[PDB]
Write a protein that binds this ligand. Sequence first.
Ligand SMILES: [Mg+2]
Ligand SMILES: [Mg+2]
Ligand SMILES: [Mg+2]
Ligand SMILES: [Mg+2]
Lengths: 45, 242, 261, 261, 37, 28, 45, 48
Amino acid sequence: FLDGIDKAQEEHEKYHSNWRAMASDFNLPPVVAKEIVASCDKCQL
Amino acid sequence: LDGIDKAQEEHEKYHSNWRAMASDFNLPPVVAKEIVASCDKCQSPGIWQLDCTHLEGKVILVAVHVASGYIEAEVIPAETGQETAYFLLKLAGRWPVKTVHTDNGSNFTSTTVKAACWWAGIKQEFGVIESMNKELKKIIGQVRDQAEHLKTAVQMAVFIHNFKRKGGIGGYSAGERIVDIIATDIQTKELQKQITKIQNFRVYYRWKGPAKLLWKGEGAVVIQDNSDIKVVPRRKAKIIRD
Amino acid sequence: FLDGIDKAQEEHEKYHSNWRAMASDFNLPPVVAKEIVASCDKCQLKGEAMHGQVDCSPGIWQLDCTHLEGKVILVAVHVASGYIEAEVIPAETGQETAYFLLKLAGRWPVKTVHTDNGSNFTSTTVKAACWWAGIKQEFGIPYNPQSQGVIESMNKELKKIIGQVRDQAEHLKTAVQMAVFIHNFKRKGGIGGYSAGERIVDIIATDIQTKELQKQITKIQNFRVYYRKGPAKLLWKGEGAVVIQDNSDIKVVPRRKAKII
Amino acid sequence: FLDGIDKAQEEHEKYHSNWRAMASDFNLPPVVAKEIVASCDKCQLKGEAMHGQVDCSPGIWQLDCTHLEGKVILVAVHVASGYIEAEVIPAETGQETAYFLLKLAGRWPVKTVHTDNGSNFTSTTVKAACWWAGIKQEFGIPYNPQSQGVIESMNKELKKIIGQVRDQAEHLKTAVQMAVFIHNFKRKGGIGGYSAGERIVDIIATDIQTKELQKQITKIQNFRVYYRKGPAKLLWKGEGAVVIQDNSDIKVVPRRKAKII
Amino acid sequence: LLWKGEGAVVIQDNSDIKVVPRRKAKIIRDYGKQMAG
Amino acid sequence: LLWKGEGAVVIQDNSDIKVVPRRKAKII
Amino acid sequence: FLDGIDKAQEEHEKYHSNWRAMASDFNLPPVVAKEIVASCDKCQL
Amino acid sequence: PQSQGVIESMNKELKKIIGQVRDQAEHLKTAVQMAVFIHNFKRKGGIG
DNA sequence: ACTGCTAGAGATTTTCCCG
DNA sequence: CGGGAAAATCTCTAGCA
DNA sequence: ACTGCTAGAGATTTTCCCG
DNA sequence: CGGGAAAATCTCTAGCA
Ligand SMILES: [Mg+2]
Ligand SMILES: [Mg+2]
Ligand SMILES: [Mg+2]
Ligand SMILES: [Mg+2]
């Protein structure tokens, strides 16, 4: 997601949260959360 | 009141601590503490590690709460006993600090730091700190772009560590863990206050010999005598201060 | 009263006599004289006698600077507990304030900050800091310090303790930290006979634990109450009563005229 | 507690922890911790929470100057009634004050005047005026305006009414006299639903009449009450009680154990 | 404490159930009374 | 008057929205 | 304790009396005197 | 960096539990299961 | 749409402890 | 059930802005 | 040995008037 | 004796210094 991707994205942009945390915090399927991490230049899965 | 025997048998079987015996059998925490403190076969929230890392020609003074992994940190202008004693006074005014471990540096051995620890009631003492320095530095690396200055990056990294990194058994952050630990410690100390208070008494039930006082409820007076816990009415017993 | 109404108005445009004066002089029911006063724009000069109540939610902090011996002290207080954070800052700038607020948010859970409308709290740097840490900002009504009564009371308490320990320390920043320590851990009172440090720990742990307890309770327990109405969700029951959430409205109903499904 | 007393004192010389903090930490009876606080000179920082009461004898006036639009207004109030006298004076001088006070004393009975310690009220010319008219001067404690609460409250009331009628008059002195009129006769309230003019007339007439009545009563009536004691002079009797003046002491005694001669 | 919601808390104060807004309520365990009984 | 809370109101004074504590307002 | 109370305790050690002196002459609160006589092994009351 | 030290910490926990269990068993093969049941259910803590 | 509070000093009432 | 003292609760203020 | 008060706005309780 | 409205009493504040 209910624009959860959008919210998780900004959370990560600031705190670079792990995928489990984003999956749980924004109710996103793991695959979507892991993609947010993969898209970031500052992280690794 | 009628679970004291049940709690006794439960502890003889399972050696369970007083918190379970009290949450389950509905007994005052002092009675359960006695049940657990009357058997031989059944026999940290204030300790901080201090250290000073270095990043980009600047000193980051770091303080880890050992039991929880909760971090307090700050770019300090000069690795000196002055700024260290200031950081320590701040820390001790925000959390209940009883013991700090440092590595025999010079900022940690000065007279100013020892004076501050003396004023605040902190005892000084001379591996988790290195790992936590590593994690802090890594978060700093992830968020160093998000700030102009490095003190802001340090505080953002501290925020992320304490509140955004859920982990461990229950999946808590270090903020929740330090809160839970300190609250348990407040319980420990208030229970000790109760016990310390009522250990200066002597009772006399039914008159029988002097007996240790354990509780003094509204409808009964729980005591101990000959390593045995007996519940007698308030009228039938006499409590005198000794 | 038709005669007296015209005269009392003429006398009121000269004298602005209160309603008792018009009622005594021109023989008027108290309601008519009161209406004469009420419709006078020049006689509306007094507010209503009450005080509001500040928000004491577990996540709200109140912030303000206070001045002592020519230095600026940035003081924050957790409203629910009375716990405090304070530092000497070099100047009342938005940058110093953003830094203080970031440190506070990284050490404690901070959902909302409530300040006055000073230039440092309204600045874009403080806004950017509050956006990053997820902190709502509440601005007090201008020229209304009672809006921040808690932090104003705490600034008095902190100034008194600094005065008490001033000659135990050379610099002011150290006296400020000694006073912070003292207030948080060496002064007991308030709701649970606590010190403020003990009290903030209890408030925050209670928040965590009750959240978890009731979440589990609502996960396992599932019912539907019909009272008087629609399918109201059940919250609590006992002692001849039920608590329900019907269309985001919580009401206490007796057990009679209430059936649980 | 012998151990804990020595420790709580050492902690108090650092922290100045209040008594609850010492009692919780060092296991102390509340009376012992309170004694530790009480004997600390650095911890005595708060007065007692009460207010006094001003003298409202029928002959007492409270005086003070107030400032408005750059002019000095000399305001007096009769404490018992709320009646007021006020004039614009050219300067806050002892001479203007002596003149005002002489006019007041020649128009109304003035036994005592109560003012603050400003230079004009303390001056020798005001003293000479007060000596001539037979007026006792009461000086308020310095820097304590609550000592003259009535005239300070009345200065607020008078400033509000002047504000209400300001645009009905050119000069300030005339607005001051219009406001005086309005307050004295066009505002009703207080103890007897009175205006202040009505009320001062009633207070002063009541004083005169009761003085005369009771003087005659004591002239004609003459007795001696013995209670419990000496020859107490009788003041009143009724409803199973007697009032006596035994050695300048008034006491209410029941009819039993009391015999009148 | 009977029920704790987001914007309101449901309490019972001497056999008298009340709904209190969240901003008007402070919720503690109180550890002294607890350790005592 | 636009909105009335506990402790404060919002008011329209010639197209100029103000927030006033209820201690400093009078509603007729 | 206060210098007066310490002097009273020393006078007890000199004279083996606790309540009869400090509770009356030294104006000590009764709770402190009771605690002292409880701690005092020479005061069987 | 949570499991890395907690594994040894809860190894110490189980050693401590056996330190009390052993008084009710002559052979470790049963005492170990006794400690395991204690640490699986009769020790309740953590979050709530 | 947002809002007086806190801590201490003394007064008053309640509770607890020996009868 | 009765006092009496000790503890708990209540009333009220300054001082912060 | 001297001392907060007053007037208004709204809330609450009391009294009076027809039953 | 019962409501209901009108009157009287109560609670509480700003603003004066
Ligand atoms: Mg401010
Ligand atoms: Mg301020
Ligand atoms: Mg003056
Ligand atoms: Mg004046």
